[PDB]
Amino acid sequence: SMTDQAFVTLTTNDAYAKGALVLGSSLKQHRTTRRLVVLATPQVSDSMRKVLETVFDEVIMVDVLDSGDSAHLTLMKRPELGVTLTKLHCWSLTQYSKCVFMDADTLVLANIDDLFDREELSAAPDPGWPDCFNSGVFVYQPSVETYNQLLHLASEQGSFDGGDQGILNTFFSSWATTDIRKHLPFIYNLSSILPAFKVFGASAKVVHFLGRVKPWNYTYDPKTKSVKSTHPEFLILWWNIFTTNVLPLLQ
Amino acid sequence: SMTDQAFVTLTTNDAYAKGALVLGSSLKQHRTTRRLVVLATPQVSDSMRKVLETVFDEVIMVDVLDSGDSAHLTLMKRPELGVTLTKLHCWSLTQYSKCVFMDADTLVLANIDDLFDREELSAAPDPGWPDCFNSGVFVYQPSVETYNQLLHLASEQGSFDGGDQGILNTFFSSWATTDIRKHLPFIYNLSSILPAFKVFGASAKVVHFLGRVKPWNYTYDPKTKSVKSTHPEFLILWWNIFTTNVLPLLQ
Ligand SMILES: O=c1ccn([C@@H]2O[C@H](COP(=O)(O)OP(=O)(O)O)[C@@H](O)[C@H]2O)c(=O)[nH]1
Numbered sequence: 001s002m003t004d005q006a007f008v009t010l011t012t013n014d015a016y017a018k019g020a021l022v023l024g025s026s027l028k029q030h031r032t033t034r035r036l037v038v039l040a041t042p043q044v045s046d047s048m049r050k051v052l053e054t055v056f057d058e059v060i061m062v063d064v065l066d067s068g069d070s071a072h073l074t075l076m077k078r079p080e081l082g083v084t085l086t087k088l089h090c091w092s093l094t095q096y097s098k099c100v101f102m103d104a105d106t107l108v109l110a111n112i113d114d115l116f117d118r119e120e121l122s123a124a125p126d127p128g129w130p131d132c133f134n135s136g137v138f139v140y141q142p143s144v145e146t147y148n149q150l151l152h153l154a155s156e157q158g159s160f161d162g163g164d165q166g167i168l169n170t171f172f173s174s175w176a177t178t179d180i181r182k183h184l185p186f187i188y189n190l191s192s193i194l195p196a197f198k199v200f201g202a203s204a205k206v207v208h209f210l211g212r213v214k215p216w217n218y219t220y221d222p223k224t225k226s227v228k229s230t231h232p233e234f235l236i237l238w239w240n241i242f243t244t245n246v247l248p249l250l251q
Numbered sequence: 252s253m254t255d256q257a258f259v260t261l262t263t264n265d266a267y268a269k270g271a272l273v274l275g276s277s278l279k280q281h282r283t284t285r286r287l288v289v290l291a292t293p294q295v296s297d298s299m300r301k302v303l304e305t306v307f308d309e310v311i312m313v314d315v316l317d318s319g320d321s322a323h324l325t326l327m328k329r330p331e332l333g334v335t336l337t338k339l340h341c342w343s344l345t346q347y348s349k350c351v352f353m354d355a356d357t358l359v360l361a362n363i364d365d366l367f368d369r370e371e372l373s374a375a376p377d378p379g380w381p382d383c384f385n386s387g388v389f390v391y392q393p394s395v396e397t398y399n400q401l402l403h404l405a406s407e408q409g410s411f412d413g414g415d416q417g418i419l420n421t422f423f424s425s426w427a428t429t430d431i432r433k434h435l436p437f438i439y440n441l442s443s444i445l446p447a448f449k450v451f452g453a454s455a456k457v458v459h460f461l462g463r464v465k466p467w468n469y470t471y472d473p474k475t476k477s478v479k480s481t482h483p484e485f486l487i488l489w490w491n492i493f494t495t496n497v498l499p500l501l502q
């Protein structure tokens with residue numbers, strides 16, 4: 001293995017846990033040589049953690065509601081940010097020298113181990129405001145200091161969008177205008193939100209299921225091998241990995 | 252003046268001509284020291300050209316249907332690209348050493364003369380596929396050679412999107428991964444297509460009315476000083492410039 005480097009994701013409940021299982025399975029399918037880590041909350045059932053342990057190398061419990069937790073004081077100032085402050089613990093994983101964070105609503109389509117050639121903070125442009133990076137996929141260097149700086153910003157300013165992206169863009173404010181290599185190609189975080197896709201979509205490495213309805217919210221029908229009601233192949237691939245690679249794992 | 256440098260736009264009919272008048276007026280309002288040039292087709296009425304001559308320094312006729320025109324042979328190979336091939340004549344303006352091209356559906360909100368500090372090809376990211384630049388605002392160096400290269404590409408490949416953006420991104424294919432200074436801030440070409448706008452929208456320099464319905468397609472009502480049926484201030488500002496600055500110009 002590479003014990004030094006990891007893909008890291010986050011699950012705060014059993015639903016998003018299904019995303020992480022598909023994500024993690026997709027990274028394994030494409031033969032990552034890196035470690036797979038999921039940050040989990042106590043809202044994730046013990047039974048679902050057990051399933052998570054079959055795909056991830058580490059299942060690391062984070063509970064911001066605990067007074068022992070580093071973020072707990074910040075949560076009391078900003079109680080609307082529990083999920084965000086949990087995600088930012090990704091910077092506390094100081095046993096790793098470099099990590100790629102990935103949202104549980106991502107799916108990997110090709111080997112993306114070359115991301116570890118990048119430096120903090122490397123991320124793809126967000127559609128809709130492309131001078132902000134999308135926080136669903138980013139390369140970072142674990143650090144207690146950086147983590148504590150991020151907590152402080154969250155304390156002072158909250159997030160301009162109620163999630164982690166605002167706060168990450170505010171702290172990492174030089175991304176839009178400094179060093180192009182920190183701009184991940186859009187194909188490493190391709191929002192499922194048209195003629196450009198016909199030309200470039202085939203080279204997609206990561207698809208990101210941005211928005212309200214997540215792939216596990218759909219009703220899957222084995223009879224038709226698809227869901228009840230743009231490029232629907234990605235949603236179908238999600239459920240292929242789920243039914244094929246994930247389902248037989250704890251038995 | 253600066254006789255060396257110009258803002259350049261394009262009008263193929265009387266409708267888009269109204270956009271160019273508002274654009275040009277907005278550049279004058281914000282006190283550009285550069286020259287204002289509009290490329291016009293014979294589909295633009297002589298009476299509307301006369302109004303255009305009150306705002307622009309040069310009204311340059313381009314007719315791709317003419318056998319004397321440089322693009323005419325390319326048009327016969329690709330007859331669906333008349334508008335595109337007309338726009339690309341912007342590169343034929345070799346009397347200027349550097350130009351900013353702007354679509355007739357842009358409106359300037361602040362002085363953007365600092366764009367002339369940039370080099371070919373400097374453009375803002377397109378929302379939706381942000382590793383392509385949006386072709387509504389770009390800094391370029393006039394050149395017969397570049398122009399002829401662009402014609403050839405148009406001949407060989409057409410455009411992957413039926414307009415000029417595909418062809419410009421294909422020719423200028425290194426934009427996404429080389430030299431960040433060629434990435435215009437999104438505020439220099441802000442698509443009217445939300446929490447990021449609350450934080451960053453106020454610093455907008457150029458708004459771009461992307462999409463089907465253009466500002467002059469709206470019915471303006473002087474009684475209410477707004478239109479019949481997101482951030483509606485931009486559309487209202489368009490019509491303010493039209494009614495205030497443009498309307499009294501030929502009398
Ligand atoms: O209720 C939640 C909210 C978010 N997350 C995690 O935080 C990330 C960011 O949220 P989300 O992906 O739902 O936002 P979006 O990507 O749609 O903008 C998710 O991918 C998860 O890893 C989670 O586990 N549970």
Ligand SMILES: O=c1ccn([C@@H]2O[C@H](COP(=O)(O)OP(=O)(O)O)[C@@H](O)[C@H]2O)c(=O)[nH]1
Binds near residue numbers: 463
């Ligand atoms: O019928 C047309 C089509 C386009 N154009 C010019 O070409 C540009 C690009 O087209 P458009 O702005 O309509 O495309 P969009 O910006 O909406 O994607 C316009 O701004 C105009 O300057 C024009 O004059 N007449």
Ligand SMILES: [Mn+2]
Binds near residue numbers: 104
């Ligand atoms: Mn996400």
Ligand SMILES: [Mn+2]
Binds near residue numbers: 460
């Ligand atoms: Mn336009």
